[PDB]
């Protein structure tokens, strides 16, 4: 007596529940017609009332690291209601596949600074401006995109 949403059909291709009859029924009552399907919660996994068969393999989950060699999972599901799928495996049980993966061959290495350059000027048409200075990672130049820690510019005032 755990109310489910009862559907009039199962779309084989998609594995989607279609034609909601409604709620407040047990799976037992829903599945009196083996042509029907149910959801235990609104929007989630559609189970057909016929005999248990393997669902479609899911989409590969994204790679566990964005820079290096990682791995990624996918699954398929025991979906049905009266029996078992392959072996002695009852429904709502997942089979898993784990695959190696890589987003990039390289990982970003960090940079080092060189030494501040000579200063620029302010404004002479009239008075009170700003003055800046510069540098670059001419030291340990960053390897794979990377970044130097801190700032490349630097400001100041000059009354002229």
């Amino acid at each position: 007596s755990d109310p489910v949403l009862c559907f009039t059909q199962y779309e084989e291709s998609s594995g989607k529940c279609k034609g909601l009859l409604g709620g407040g029924v047990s799976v037992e009552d829903c599945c009196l017609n083996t042509a029907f399907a149910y959801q235990k919660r609104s929007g989630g996994l559609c189970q057909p009332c016929r005999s248990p068969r393997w669902s479609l393999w899911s989409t590969w989950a994204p790679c566990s690291v964005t820079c290096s060699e990682g791995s990624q999972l996918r699954y398929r599901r025991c979906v049905g209601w009266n029996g078992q799928c392959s072996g002695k495996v009852a429904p709502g049980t997942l089979e898993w596949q784990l695959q190696a993966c890589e987003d990039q061959q390289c990982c970003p290495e960090m940079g080092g600074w060189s030494g501040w350059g000579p200063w620029e000027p302010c404004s002479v048409t009239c008075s009170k401006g700003t003055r800046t200075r510069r540098r670059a990672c001419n030291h340990p130049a960053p390897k794979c995109g990377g970044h130097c820690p801190g700032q490349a510019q630097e400001s100041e005032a000059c009354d002229t």
Partner: protein, 208 residues
């Protein structure tokens, strides 16, 4: 004087299905009590859509289970045909599962039959394959996922006819031959590379 009240929800039609659940209407009447002398009528709907349960199971047609494995390749009045250009036969079966409450039996063949050549235990000349692609990481949810690729001593199959007759039917090789290669990296049959799968994610039910 007397404010109306709704009586109990009741059916309006017989449930329109002979098995399982259907979609009907239930109605109720403002007569519990009936309004009197200017007292208000009942608020809300006198009608609603309802699921009706027959509590009766529908027939369930049987369904073929998956084909089993091919039986050994053999010819009727011969101890053996293996490593010989002699067509045999083999069969595989399936069971009609789940037929219930006067449902239909499964249609078509319970047995599947084909012509074969037996190369079971037959020594053949081989050559080494190039590396397979890396297999899956095994076990995929277990403690120490490792993936593998192999080079195999693949066998050179005899140039036998694809077909046969009884005065044309397809003939398929069956059986695990014993291919003969030059030794590669100390192996006669299989050379394997393994490596650990990295940054392995814990696999947790995507329905919480």
């Amino acid at each position: 004087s007397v404010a109306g009240g709704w009586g109990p929800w009741g059916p309006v039609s017989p449930c329109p299905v002979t098995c399982g659940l259907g979609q009907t209407m239930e109605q109720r009447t403002c007569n519990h009590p009936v309004p009197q002398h200017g007292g208000p009528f009942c608020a809300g709907d006198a009608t609603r859509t309802h699921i009706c349960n027959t509590a009766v199971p529908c027939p369930v047609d049987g369904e073929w289970d998956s084909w089993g494995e091919w039986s050994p390749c053999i010819r009727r009045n011969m101890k053996s045909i293996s490593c010989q250009e002699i067509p045999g036969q083999q069969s595989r079966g399936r069971t009609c599962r789940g037929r219930k409450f006067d449902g239909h039996r499964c249609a078509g063949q319970q047995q599947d039959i084909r012509h074969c050549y037996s190369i079971q235990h037959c020594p053949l000349k081989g050559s080494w394959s190039e590396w397979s692609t890396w297999g899956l990481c095994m076990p995929p949810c277990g403690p120490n996922p490792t993936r593998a690729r192999q080079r195999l001593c693949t066998p050179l199959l005899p140039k036998y006819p694809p077909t046969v007759s009884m005065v044309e039917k397809n003939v398929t090789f069956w059986g695990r031959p014993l291919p003969r290669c030059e030794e590669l990296q100390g192996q006669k049959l299989v050379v394997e590379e393994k490596r650990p799968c990295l940054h392995v994610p814990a696999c947790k039910d995507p329905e919480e």
